[PDB]
Structure formats: C-alpha cells, structure tokens
Amino acid sequence: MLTMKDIIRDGHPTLRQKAAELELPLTKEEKETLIAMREFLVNSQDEEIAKRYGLRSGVGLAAPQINISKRMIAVLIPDDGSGKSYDYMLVNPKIVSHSVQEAYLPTGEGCLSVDDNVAGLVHRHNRITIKAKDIEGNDIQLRLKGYPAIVFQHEIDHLNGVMFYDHIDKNHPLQPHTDAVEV
Ligand SMILES: O=C(O)C[C@@H](Cc1ccccc1)[C@H](O)SCc1ccccc1
Ligand code: NI
C-alpha cells in the first residue's frame, strides 16, 4: 500500500527526467505498481483511510512521482454532478491532437510532490485526444475536455519532467489568457 512517504518531493531529480516508454506486455511488477497508484488515489479520496494514513487527496498520479521513471499514469476523478467519472490506468499515453483554445483552473494547480502552494494560472488545452495502452496492452483513445483534460495534461507533463509551476507567467501569474475557458 502506497502512502505520502512513497511520493518524492520537488527537487528530487527523477521529477525532472524524461520517463521511459514501456515495452508490452508489462511485467507483473509493472502491473502491481500501476494498480497501487490507482489504489493510492482511491485511498486518498476515502475520508477515513486518508485520515488514518495521512494521505493528501489526489485525482492523478504519474510513476515518476513514486520515483519510477516510466510512462504510466493513473487518473481517478469521481462523479461531480455531471454523471461523468474518469477511472484510467494508462501506459505510454500520448496527446495526438488538441484544441487551440486554452483552459485554466482559476485557483491555479496543486501537486502531491509539491509541499507548498504556488499561486498562478496554468493555461492548458481545453480539448485533447489521447492514445494510450491499458494495463493488458489493449488500445485506448480518450477524447477529453475541461477538468479531465487539465488533469491528464498535468500527469503527462510529469512524464516529460515538466512541473505545473513552469507554465505560470512570471509577471502576470493571475492574468487569464484571451478566450481561455475557466473550468
Ligand atoms: O500530484 C499530482 O500529480 C496529483 C494532483 C493533480 C492535479 C492538481 C491540480 C490540477 C490538476 C491535477 C492532485 O490530484 S490535486 C488534489 C485534489 C484532490 C481532490 C480534489 C481536488 C484536488
Ligand atoms: Ni503533480
């Protein structure tokens, strides 16, 4: 069972490397680690378990964040009211197309690997298409918009050694871009 002590912190070099593509099929050990990543998000979102084990709530986790330099991510976004939820373990995910139009969380972003908050809007694509493999090496294409697009782009940044705060404007951190949609 993963906990916060498994999450490496900003400054750890693994967070700034470029994660490696996986060969398919995955090793038993690789499956186990991807299931535990999802299991972490599930645990962090249960108020009892998260309290008992001191978990920060998460909707996304990339393997580099537990110091494994490999291109797999977990996303767990619970139903918010839409009837739409997102429960995805992805191998070698890749953004293949996206909108020109940007979007931003008006609160800015947070990160399990970042102990402090950094203020500033992080502009991303409002709409993306992703090709990935699932845990069994089958093919997945995701068409995502808004909150889920932002989450997946955040997790994929991790695989290219990019950190949310790198996108924050230096002089005008809270300046929305022209026609950017607020989520
Ligand atoms: O540390 C991570 O990579 C997981 C982040 C991802 C994220 C943060 C901000 C914006 C998009 C993605 C955590 O999931 S943030 C914590 C959280 C948990 C439940 C509800 C809202 C926020
Ligand atoms: Ni993060």
PDB file of C-alpha atoms and ligand atoms in Angstrom:
ATOM      1  CA  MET A   1       0.000   0.000   0.000  1.00  0.00           C
ATOM      2  CA  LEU A   2       1.441   3.391  -1.082  1.00  0.00           C
ATOM      3  CA  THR A   3       1.390   6.488   1.228  1.00  0.00           C
ATOM      4  CA  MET A   4       2.868  10.054   1.182  1.00  0.00           C
ATOM      5  CA  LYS A   5       6.300   8.637   2.160  1.00  0.00           C
ATOM      6  CA  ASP A   6       6.345   6.931  -1.327  1.00  0.00           C
ATOM      7  CA  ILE A   7       5.844  10.347  -3.111  1.00  0.00           C
ATOM      8  CA  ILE A   8       9.186  12.107  -3.918  1.00  0.00           C
ATOM      9  CA  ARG A   9       9.213  15.882  -3.462  1.00  0.00           C
ATOM     10  CA  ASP A  10      10.010  18.823  -5.751  1.00  0.00           C
ATOM     11  CA  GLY A  11      13.865  18.945  -6.032  1.00  0.00           C
ATOM     12  CA  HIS A  12      14.125  15.149  -6.402  1.00  0.00           C
ATOM     13  CA  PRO A  13      15.947  14.702  -9.772  1.00  0.00           C
ATOM     14  CA  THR A  14      13.600  11.866 -11.042  1.00  0.00           C
ATOM     15  CA  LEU A  15      10.794  14.507 -11.284  1.00  0.00           C
ATOM     16  CA  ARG A  16      12.894  16.427 -13.912  1.00  0.00           C
ATOM     17  CA  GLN A  17      13.870  13.409 -16.091  1.00  0.00           C
ATOM     18  CA  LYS A  18      12.033  12.139 -19.210  1.00  0.00           C
ATOM     19  CA  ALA A  19      10.250   8.879 -18.228  1.00  0.00           C
ATOM     20  CA  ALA A  20      10.944   5.818 -20.479  1.00  0.00           C
ATOM     21  CA  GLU A  21       8.382   4.151 -22.775  1.00  0.00           C
ATOM     22  CA  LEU A  22       7.198   0.735 -21.559  1.00  0.00           C
ATOM     23  CA  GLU A  23       7.532  -2.464 -23.592  1.00  0.00           C
ATOM     24  CA  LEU A  24       4.382  -4.560 -23.841  1.00  0.00           C
ATOM     25  CA  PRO A  25       3.318  -6.712 -22.273  1.00  0.00           C
ATOM     26  CA  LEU A  26       4.061  -5.090 -18.856  1.00  0.00           C
ATOM     27  CA  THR A  27       5.970  -7.092 -16.190  1.00  0.00           C
ATOM     28  CA  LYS A  28       3.961  -8.423 -13.240  1.00  0.00           C
ATOM     29  CA  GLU A  29       5.904  -5.855 -11.173  1.00  0.00           C
ATOM     30  CA  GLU A  30       4.802  -3.010 -13.517  1.00  0.00           C
ATOM     31  CA  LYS A  31       1.088  -4.066 -13.275  1.00  0.00           C
ATOM     32  CA  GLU A  32       1.365  -4.177  -9.447  1.00  0.00           C
ATOM     33  CA  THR A  33       2.833  -0.654  -9.295  1.00  0.00           C
ATOM     34  CA  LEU A  34       0.132   0.778 -11.666  1.00  0.00           C
ATOM     35  CA  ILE A  35      -2.708  -0.851  -9.592  1.00  0.00           C
ATOM     36  CA  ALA A  36      -1.114   0.538  -6.350  1.00  0.00           C
ATOM     37  CA  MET A  37      -1.022   4.046  -7.960  1.00  0.00           C
ATOM     38  CA  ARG A  38      -4.770   3.870  -8.653  1.00  0.00           C
ATOM     39  CA  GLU A  39      -5.279   2.328  -5.172  1.00  0.00           C
ATOM     40  CA  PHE A  40      -3.435   5.362  -3.704  1.00  0.00           C
ATOM     41  CA  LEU A  41      -5.880   7.776  -5.406  1.00  0.00           C
ATOM     42  CA  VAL A  42      -8.891   5.685  -4.213  1.00  0.00           C
ATOM     43  CA  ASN A  43      -7.421   5.631  -0.628  1.00  0.00           C
ATOM     44  CA  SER A  44      -6.600   9.403  -0.667  1.00  0.00           C
ATOM     45  CA  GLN A  45     -10.277  10.094  -1.626  1.00  0.00           C
ATOM     46  CA  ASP A  46     -11.787   7.959   1.237  1.00  0.00           C
ATOM     47  CA  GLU A  47     -12.059  10.352   4.266  1.00  0.00           C
ATOM     48  CA  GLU A  48     -11.445   7.515   6.859  1.00  0.00           C
ATOM     49  CA  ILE A  49      -8.430   5.830   5.174  1.00  0.00           C
ATOM     50  CA  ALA A  50      -6.911   9.230   4.176  1.00  0.00           C
ATOM     51  CA  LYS A  51      -7.168  10.411   7.828  1.00  0.00           C
ATOM     52  CA  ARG A  52      -5.799   7.095   9.231  1.00  0.00           C
ATOM     53  CA  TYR A  53      -2.772   7.175   6.811  1.00  0.00           C
ATOM     54  CA  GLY A  54      -2.261  10.985   6.439  1.00  0.00           C
ATOM     55  CA  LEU A  55      -2.995  10.983   2.630  1.00  0.00           C
ATOM     56  CA  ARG A  56      -3.403  14.238   0.598  1.00  0.00           C
ATOM     57  CA  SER A  57      -6.422  13.815  -1.774  1.00  0.00           C
ATOM     58  CA  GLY A  58      -5.372  13.196  -5.395  1.00  0.00           C
ATOM     59  CA  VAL A  59      -7.112  12.785  -8.781  1.00  0.00           C
ATOM     60  CA  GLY A  60      -3.858  11.951 -10.703  1.00  0.00           C
ATOM     61  CA  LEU A  61      -0.528  10.126 -10.171  1.00  0.00           C
ATOM     62  CA  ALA A  62       2.392   9.635 -12.608  1.00  0.00           C
ATOM     63  CA  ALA A  63       5.042   6.898 -11.962  1.00  0.00           C
ATOM     64  CA  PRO A  64       7.935   9.488 -11.674  1.00  0.00           C
ATOM     65  CA  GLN A  65       6.202  10.857  -8.509  1.00  0.00           C
ATOM     66  CA  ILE A  66       6.920   7.492  -6.726  1.00  0.00           C
ATOM     67  CA  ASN A  67      10.433   7.659  -8.275  1.00  0.00           C
ATOM     68  CA  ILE A  68       9.847   5.147 -11.170  1.00  0.00           C
ATOM     69  CA  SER A  69      10.971   6.775 -14.468  1.00  0.00           C
ATOM     70  CA  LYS A  70       8.334   5.037 -16.647  1.00  0.00           C
ATOM     71  CA  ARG A  71       5.488   6.340 -18.813  1.00  0.00           C
ATOM     72  CA  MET A  72       2.393   5.225 -16.837  1.00  0.00           C
ATOM     73  CA  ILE A  73      -0.278   7.311 -15.106  1.00  0.00           C
ATOM     74  CA  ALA A  74      -3.393   6.790 -13.011  1.00  0.00           C
ATOM     75  CA  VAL A  75      -6.441   9.089 -13.068  1.00  0.00           C
ATOM     76  CA  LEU A  76      -9.423   8.827 -10.703  1.00  0.00           C
ATOM     77  CA  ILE A  77     -11.927  11.715 -10.996  1.00  0.00           C
ATOM     78  CA  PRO A  78     -15.127  10.928  -9.110  1.00  0.00           C
ATOM     79  CA  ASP A  79     -18.609  11.872 -10.448  1.00  0.00           C
ATOM     80  CA  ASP A  80     -19.077  15.574  -9.604  1.00  0.00           C
ATOM     81  CA  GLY A  81     -22.746  16.050 -10.602  1.00  0.00           C
ATOM     82  CA  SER A  82     -22.300  15.569 -14.404  1.00  0.00           C
ATOM     83  CA  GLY A  83     -22.729  11.749 -14.233  1.00  0.00           C
ATOM     84  CA  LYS A  84     -19.181  11.750 -15.808  1.00  0.00           C
ATOM     85  CA  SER A  85     -16.316   9.992 -13.969  1.00  0.00           C
ATOM     86  CA  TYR A  86     -12.771   9.031 -15.026  1.00  0.00           C
ATOM     87  CA  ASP A  87     -11.049   5.846 -13.794  1.00  0.00           C
ATOM     88  CA  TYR A  88      -7.999   5.205 -16.054  1.00  0.00           C
ATOM     89  CA  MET A  89      -4.646   3.396 -15.741  1.00  0.00           C
ATOM     90  CA  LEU A  90      -2.716   4.367 -18.918  1.00  0.00           C
ATOM     91  CA  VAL A  91       0.553   3.010 -20.389  1.00  0.00           C
ATOM     92  CA  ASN A  92       2.604   5.181 -22.805  1.00  0.00           C
ATOM     93  CA  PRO A  93      -0.148   7.830 -23.042  1.00  0.00           C
ATOM     94  CA  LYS A  94       0.353  10.420 -25.853  1.00  0.00           C
ATOM     95  CA  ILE A  95      -1.567  13.654 -26.728  1.00  0.00           C
ATOM     96  CA  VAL A  96      -2.137  13.253 -30.502  1.00  0.00           C
ATOM     97  CA  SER A  97      -4.404  16.318 -31.128  1.00  0.00           C
ATOM     98  CA  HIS A  98      -5.792  19.251 -29.147  1.00  0.00           C
ATOM     99  CA  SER A  99      -7.822  22.480 -29.361  1.00  0.00           C
ATOM    100  CA  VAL A 100      -6.134  25.866 -29.908  1.00  0.00           C
ATOM    101  CA  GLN A 101      -8.451  27.218 -27.184  1.00  0.00           C
ATOM    102  CA  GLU A 102      -6.862  27.075 -23.673  1.00  0.00           C
ATOM    103  CA  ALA A 103      -8.388  26.430 -20.189  1.00  0.00           C
ATOM    104  CA  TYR A 104      -7.316  27.082 -16.582  1.00  0.00           C
ATOM    105  CA  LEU A 105      -8.389  26.275 -13.035  1.00  0.00           C
ATOM    106  CA  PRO A 106      -8.978  29.768 -11.583  1.00  0.00           C
ATOM    107  CA  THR A 107      -7.473  28.571  -8.244  1.00  0.00           C
ATOM    108  CA  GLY A 108      -4.282  27.517 -10.101  1.00  0.00           C
ATOM    109  CA  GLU A 109      -2.965  23.942  -9.559  1.00  0.00           C
ATOM    110  CA  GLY A 110      -1.513  21.705  -6.819  1.00  0.00           C
ATOM    111  CA  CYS A 111       0.798  18.676  -6.761  1.00  0.00           C
ATOM    112  CA  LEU A 112       1.343  15.753  -4.309  1.00  0.00           C
ATOM    113  CA  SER A 113       5.130  16.246  -4.970  1.00  0.00           C
ATOM    114  CA  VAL A 114       4.897  19.976  -4.051  1.00  0.00           C
ATOM    115  CA  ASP A 115       4.542  20.613  -0.274  1.00  0.00           C
ATOM    116  CA  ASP A 116       3.995  24.409  -0.706  1.00  0.00           C
ATOM    117  CA  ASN A 117       1.281  26.071  -2.871  1.00  0.00           C
ATOM    118  CA  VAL A 118       2.463  28.235  -5.837  1.00  0.00           C
ATOM    119  CA  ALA A 119      -0.064  30.902  -6.938  1.00  0.00           C
ATOM    120  CA  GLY A 120      -0.661  31.362 -10.682  1.00  0.00           C
ATOM    121  CA  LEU A 121      -2.925  30.203 -13.547  1.00  0.00           C
ATOM    122  CA  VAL A 122      -1.688  27.187 -15.585  1.00  0.00           C
ATOM    123  CA  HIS A 123      -3.113  27.520 -19.145  1.00  0.00           C
ATOM    124  CA  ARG A 124      -3.553  24.142 -20.895  1.00  0.00           C
ATOM    125  CA  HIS A 125      -5.624  22.923 -23.937  1.00  0.00           C
ATOM    126  CA  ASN A 126      -9.409  22.849 -23.278  1.00  0.00           C
ATOM    127  CA  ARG A 127      -9.724  19.726 -25.538  1.00  0.00           C
ATOM    128  CA  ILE A 128      -7.298  16.851 -26.176  1.00  0.00           C
ATOM    129  CA  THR A 129      -7.232  13.414 -27.806  1.00  0.00           C
ATOM    130  CA  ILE A 130      -5.033  10.790 -26.123  1.00  0.00           C
ATOM    131  CA  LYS A 131      -3.796   7.438 -27.442  1.00  0.00           C
ATOM    132  CA  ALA A 132      -2.522   5.006 -24.788  1.00  0.00           C
ATOM    133  CA  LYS A 133      -2.309   1.315 -23.896  1.00  0.00           C
ATOM    134  CA  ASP A 134      -4.218  -0.207 -20.957  1.00  0.00           C
ATOM    135  CA  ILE A 135      -2.571  -2.465 -18.262  1.00  0.00           C
ATOM    136  CA  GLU A 136      -3.251  -5.518 -20.569  1.00  0.00           C
ATOM    137  CA  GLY A 137      -1.718  -3.802 -23.677  1.00  0.00           C
ATOM    138  CA  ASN A 138      -5.122  -3.022 -25.339  1.00  0.00           C
ATOM    139  CA  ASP A 139      -5.668   0.305 -27.168  1.00  0.00           C
ATOM    140  CA  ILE A 140      -7.454   3.324 -25.648  1.00  0.00           C
ATOM    141  CA  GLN A 141      -8.338   6.602 -27.315  1.00  0.00           C
ATOM    142  CA  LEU A 142      -9.697   9.290 -24.943  1.00  0.00           C
ATOM    143  CA  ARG A 143     -11.493  12.479 -26.084  1.00  0.00           C
ATOM    144  CA  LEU A 144     -11.353  14.795 -23.038  1.00  0.00           C
ATOM    145  CA  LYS A 145     -12.462  18.378 -22.344  1.00  0.00           C
ATOM    146  CA  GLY A 146     -12.284  20.771 -19.382  1.00  0.00           C
ATOM    147  CA  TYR A 147     -11.404  19.425 -15.900  1.00  0.00           C
ATOM    148  CA  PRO A 148     -10.368  15.909 -17.138  1.00  0.00           C
ATOM    149  CA  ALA A 149      -8.237  17.334 -19.998  1.00  0.00           C
ATOM    150  CA  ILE A 150      -6.391  19.549 -17.411  1.00  0.00           C
ATOM    151  CA  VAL A 151      -5.773  16.546 -15.082  1.00  0.00           C
ATOM    152  CA  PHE A 152      -4.400  14.253 -17.847  1.00  0.00           C
ATOM    153  CA  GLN A 153      -2.178  17.087 -19.268  1.00  0.00           C
ATOM    154  CA  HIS A 154      -0.814  17.574 -15.680  1.00  0.00           C
ATOM    155  CA  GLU A 155       0.012  13.815 -15.373  1.00  0.00           C
ATOM    156  CA  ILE A 156       1.636  13.685 -18.846  1.00  0.00           C
ATOM    157  CA  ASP A 157       3.781  16.796 -18.034  1.00  0.00           C
ATOM    158  CA  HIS A 158       5.275  14.575 -15.242  1.00  0.00           C
ATOM    159  CA  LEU A 159       6.487  12.042 -17.895  1.00  0.00           C
ATOM    160  CA  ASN A 160       8.389  14.849 -19.738  1.00  0.00           C
ATOM    161  CA  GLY A 161       9.912  16.193 -16.465  1.00  0.00           C
ATOM    162  CA  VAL A 162       7.593  19.296 -16.566  1.00  0.00           C
ATOM    163  CA  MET A 163       6.072  20.776 -13.330  1.00  0.00           C
ATOM    164  CA  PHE A 164       2.764  22.741 -13.240  1.00  0.00           C
ATOM    165  CA  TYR A 165       4.539  25.920 -11.949  1.00  0.00           C
ATOM    166  CA  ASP A 166       6.760  26.009 -15.105  1.00  0.00           C
ATOM    167  CA  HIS A 167       3.601  27.211 -17.012  1.00  0.00           C
ATOM    168  CA  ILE A 168       2.976  30.128 -14.567  1.00  0.00           C
ATOM    169  CA  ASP A 169       3.508  33.645 -16.040  1.00  0.00           C
ATOM    170  CA  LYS A 170       6.314  35.389 -14.150  1.00  0.00           C
ATOM    171  CA  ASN A 171       4.917  38.986 -14.165  1.00  0.00           C
ATOM    172  CA  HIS A 172       1.143  38.289 -14.564  1.00  0.00           C
ATOM    173  CA  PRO A 173       0.611  34.927 -12.816  1.00  0.00           C
ATOM    174  CA  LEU A 174      -3.184  35.540 -12.369  1.00  0.00           C
ATOM    175  CA  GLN A 175      -3.781  37.130 -15.819  1.00  0.00           C
ATOM    176  CA  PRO A 176      -6.259  34.873 -17.746  1.00  0.00           C
ATOM    177  CA  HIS A 177      -5.240  34.466 -21.443  1.00  0.00           C
ATOM    178  CA  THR A 178      -7.539  35.848 -24.163  1.00  0.00           C
ATOM    179  CA  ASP A 179     -10.566  33.488 -24.706  1.00  0.00           C
ATOM    180  CA  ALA A 180      -9.141  30.891 -22.242  1.00  0.00           C
ATOM    181  CA  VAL A 181     -12.112  28.987 -20.669  1.00  0.00           C
ATOM    182  CA  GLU A 182     -12.296  28.986 -16.835  1.00  0.00           C
ATOM    183  CA  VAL A 183     -13.165  25.433 -15.530  1.00  0.00           C
TER     184      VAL A 183
HETATM  185  O1  LIG B   1       0.233  15.498  -7.575  1.00  0.00           O
HETATM  186  C1  LIG B   1      -0.464  15.101  -8.659  1.00  0.00           C
HETATM  187  O2  LIG B   1       0.079  14.876  -9.775  1.00  0.00           O
HETATM  188  C2  LIG B   1      -1.957  14.942  -8.464  1.00  0.00           C
HETATM  189  C3  LIG B   1      -2.694  16.281  -8.382  1.00  0.00           C
HETATM  190  C4  LIG B   1      -3.082  16.550  -9.850  1.00  0.00           C
HETATM  191  C5  LIG B   1      -3.700  17.896 -10.214  1.00  0.00           C
HETATM  192  C6  LIG B   1      -3.662  19.042  -9.404  1.00  0.00           C
HETATM  193  C7  LIG B   1      -4.261  20.218  -9.817  1.00  0.00           C
HETATM  194  C8  LIG B   1      -4.893  20.248 -11.047  1.00  0.00           C
HETATM  195  C9  LIG B   1      -4.936  19.130 -11.865  1.00  0.00           C
HETATM  196  C10 LIG B   1      -4.340  17.954 -11.452  1.00  0.00           C
HETATM  197  C11 LIG B   1      -3.807  16.118  -7.326  1.00  0.00           C
HETATM  198  O3  LIG B   1      -4.782  15.234  -7.912  1.00  0.00           O
HETATM  199  S1  LIG B   1      -4.544  17.628  -6.687  1.00  0.00           S
HETATM  200  C12 LIG B   1      -5.553  17.340  -5.251  1.00  0.00           C
HETATM  201  C13 LIG B   1      -7.085  17.262  -5.364  1.00  0.00           C
HETATM  202  C14 LIG B   1      -7.770  16.118  -4.924  1.00  0.00           C
HETATM  203  C15 LIG B   1      -9.157  16.007  -4.977  1.00  0.00           C
HETATM  204  C16 LIG B   1      -9.897  17.063  -5.473  1.00  0.00           C
HETATM  205  C17 LIG B   1      -9.238  18.218  -5.900  1.00  0.00           C
HETATM  206  C18 LIG B   1      -7.845  18.328  -5.839  1.00  0.00           C
HETATM  207 NI    NI B   2       1.878  16.977  -9.667  1.00  0.00          NI
END
